[PDB]
């Protein structure tokens, strides 16, 4: 069959702006044909680690929906976007389930997301009372209470603001340079699967 209506992967990977890791964007991809070989054969990605499925058979399998979660993290924090990991990003910003089927794609973005004065537009949640559940988004800006005293709204002693900005300079090391991460989540539900791979001729 002649195929059209490819899945819109251009508006996620080639987006002019990415979201912050605390407020990571989720785009639901449905009712199209997903060509995954375009992503896999690209040389622009530093991490293309797939958990629970292999990239070769992605272009054949069919899924109900594809969830594209997009954010920016540091170079040293790409390791924490994996099942079972521990860190600031995993516990307080973006948590992946252990039974996760999907792919974590990350690439260096020092060219776009770093400016000479410092790019402070990307923020991360540094403190939360409890760890996040898998696929939870916390965009609350309530003052963290680290001590018995009632914070009472004011940032004083033992009371800190949970969202801390990130500093991005072009001269930083590879472990501090901004990395754009897109996590694709593949699920199969009782509804008929509509995100199928292309059928080769």
């Amino acid at each position: 069959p002649n195929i059209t209506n490819l899945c819109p992967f251009g508006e996620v990977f080639n987006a002019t702006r990415f979201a912050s890791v605390y407020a990571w964007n989720r785009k639901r991809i449905s009712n199209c044909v997903a060509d995954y070989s375009v992503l896999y054969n690209s040389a622009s990605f530093s991490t293309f680690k797939c958990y629970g499925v292999s990239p070769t058979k992605l272009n054949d399998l069919c899924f109900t929906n594809v969830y594209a979660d997009s954010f920016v993290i540091r170079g040293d924090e790409v390791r924490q976007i994996a099942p079972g990991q521990t860190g600031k990003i995993a516990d307080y910003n973006y948590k992946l389930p252990d039974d996760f089927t999907g792919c974590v794609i990350a690439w260096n973005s020092n060219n776009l997301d770093s400016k000479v004065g410092g790019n402070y537009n990307y923020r991360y949640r540094l403190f939360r009372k409890s760890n996040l559940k898998p696929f939870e988004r916390d965009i609350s800006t309530e003052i963290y209470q680290a001590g018995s005293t009632p914070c009472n709204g004011v940032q004083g002693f033992n009371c800190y603001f949970p969202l801390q900005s990130y500093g991005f300079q072009p001269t930083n090391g590879v472990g501090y340079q901004p990395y754009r991460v897109v996590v694709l989540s593949f699920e199969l539900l009782h509804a008929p699967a509509t995100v199928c791979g292309p059928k080769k001729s």
């Binding site: 410092g118 540094l126 403190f127 680290a146 001590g147 033992n158 801390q164 500093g167």
Partner: peptide, 15 residues
Amino acid sequence: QAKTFLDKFNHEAED
């Protein structure tokens, strides 16, 4: 309390 304060320090002191 000291560990949270030290995290807040190391973060805003490295930049």
